[PDB]
Amino acid sequence: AMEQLLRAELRTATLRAFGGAGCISEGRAYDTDAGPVFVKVNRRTQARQMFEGEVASLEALRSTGLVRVPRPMKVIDLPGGGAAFVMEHLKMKSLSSQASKLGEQMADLHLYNQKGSSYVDKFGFHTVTCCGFIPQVNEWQDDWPTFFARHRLQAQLDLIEKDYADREARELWSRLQVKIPDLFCGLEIVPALLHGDLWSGNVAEDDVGPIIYDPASFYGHSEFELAIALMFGGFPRSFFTAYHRKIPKAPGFDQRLLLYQLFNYLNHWNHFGREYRSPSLGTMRRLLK
Amino acid sequence: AMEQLLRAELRTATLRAFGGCISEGRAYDTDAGPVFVKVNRRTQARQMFEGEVASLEALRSTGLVRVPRPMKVIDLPGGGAAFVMEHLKMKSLSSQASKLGEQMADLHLYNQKGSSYVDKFGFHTVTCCGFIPQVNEWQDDWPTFFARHRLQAQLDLIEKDYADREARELWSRLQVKIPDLFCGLEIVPALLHGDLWSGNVAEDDVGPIIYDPASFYGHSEFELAIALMFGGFPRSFFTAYHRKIPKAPGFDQRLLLYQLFNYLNHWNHFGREYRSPSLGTMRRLLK
Ligand SMILES: Nc1ncnc2c1ncn2[C@@H]1O[C@H](COP(=O)(O)OP(=O)(O)O)[C@@H](O)[C@H]1O
Ligand SMILES: Nc1ncnc2c1ncn2[C@@H]1O[C@H](COP(=O)(O)OP(=O)(O)O)[C@@H](O)[C@H]1O
Ligand SMILES: O=C(CN1CCOCC1)[C@@H](O)[C@H](O)[C@H](O)CO
Ligand SMILES: O=C(CN1CCOCC1)[C@@H](O)[C@H](O)[C@H](O)CO
């Protein structure tokens, strides 16, 4: 895909993706008397809530001992509104040689609730975790399709109705709601702890192995994790090969992939505007065909 | 400031910065240099990028402002396009603000003062202020161009998508009043960056840089509306600019009209969070 096309169009052997930073917050590294730190700053009223959700997500991931993520250090209220979030600084480059290792770790992470001393038998989370700026409901639910329809898709489409009053999105959603159970093939879904935002921009590596960060975690269907990884690219094929060697694709994976990508398109419509209307409606129509 | 707050909360004497999306894309080190690649998967990505290339080319041809050099527009398998350009190591505009003010004023004076005068408002191709394509059809009269191909275009989209009664009624009243803000003044076409908000300007060790243009020949004052309305420019930017192009009479009222355009564009891009500023600005203009 992209990287091969660029090597050809620009006629280069090497191509190494690199690189205040961030889509939601302003992030900067500082050296301090006790070593380096990384600080995210967000001036919006809800910033503390956002960062507390990130802290809870980082803590949940660190507790598994299966992946490396930055240690959360402090959330600081700012005079004039908003908050700063200080965490451990990690020297990092984009994910490349460590992709297959990350695929193993992400599969082990999803499997931990099933295989480990872990007993979470509902979907959701113990606290609010933000989809970028947007707070998510993580109310525990026994049924994954219910949790995903109500607390992910319907939540996003209610915000689209409030902000864009989009007739087509409303009418397509009413039809898709009816279809959703058929996409699950009568499978028994088991809760899996998710990073929650595993875009290629949120993963990286150093000389020890891969690193992931910026989580928005909850107990969900393991497959949901991969949708954003696939739709914006940037992961080597060997990441998915390693992952699916441990967690094979269940029947209907390809159709659920559209459903989970739909959620991310809706979230990008809400965060970033009407540019994301066409893929949102287009994915709904593809699911309804 | 926030840095003193961090020193206090982390209990550290030192705090030395180091290490130096939004549906853009990514940067890549490349054999022949660093490059920056913008990706857009939508069907109209190529037209969008060709407008950005045309704008960058028009600005580069003045030699007055530093912009990234366009390299290639690539059709992407499965729709959309990538736009590859020279990579620039950049930081927030700060020390170079007054220099950029000077350069932007020279840019706006370039057309009037040069050899090959463009005598109409508009542009030779479509350019996008963000994602929405604009009409750049040449017009002799700036208030005509702006009312028709900027304000009316945005309000037609708002009527189409939102059927907003208040916007429709306020525009009915405002349209006739526009020429009052321009009477008794000479308006010369000026080449504009077209989207000069603080997030589209920066600097390095050599000087300021501007990027993501949506260019057209317009009233010079239009440039500054989005710079002012969202902040982020040092005062010295404007001081330097207005030493060369002083605020003409009626500047503050035209400023509201130009900011109105940007509020409407944001309503069309991002939805009804921008409805209140749009209608309020129209009411201010009617008071
Ligand atoms: N703990 C860290 N140490 C060093 N660099 C980091 C760290 N966390 C993030 N970064 C850098 O900051 C960028 C943005 O971080 P991210 O958590 O994705 O911010 P946002 O939520 O605002 O997008 C990352 O691509 C990475 O380059
Ligand atoms: N030529 C470049 N070299 C290096 N970084 C760039 C270049 N162009 C843009 N960037 C970075 O990408 C960010 C967004 O660029 P921009 O052209 O505004 O994209 P968009 O149209 O998606 O907003 C900038 O704020 C800057 O940090
Ligand atoms: O920002 C994120 C990823 N998108 C940024 C815009 O270019 C496409 C990838 C993630 O942190 C998340 O899915 C959400 O966008 C946060 O708002
Ligand atoms: O994105 C832009 C600037 N706005 C981003 C949201 O915070 C206020 C400034 C520009 O590219 C353009 O003026 C238009 O918004 C379409 O993108």
Ligand SMILES: [Mg+2]
């Ligand atoms: Mg920009």
